Amino acid sequence: MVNVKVEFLGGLDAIFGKQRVHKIKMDKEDPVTVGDLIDHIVSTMINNPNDVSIFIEDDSIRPGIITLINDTDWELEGEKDYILEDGDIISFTSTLHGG
Ligand SMILES: [Mg+2]
Ligand SMILES: [Mg+2]
16 A cells, blocks of 8 residues: 655646645555556546546657656656655646656
């Protein structure tokens, strides 16, 4: 079981009922990855399926969204492969600069 927070920034809150910060309890036994977290967000937290394409394209984070893991570019942590620890904070920012 792992507890993390996710932040939906650069306007992404619009697909999450205008709520920017979400507390997430991942019930899965360790290890739980950022890939698992994204699956969870898509499966349970996007309340209009028409908005899923705003968050993911071809089952990957949508081009134009920057993902930071504890204030760090997720590339430096293995991206989807990063293993969540209790208290981690993951933010997603929509921006024209995003990759
Ligand atoms: Mg710091
Ligand atoms: Mg550490």
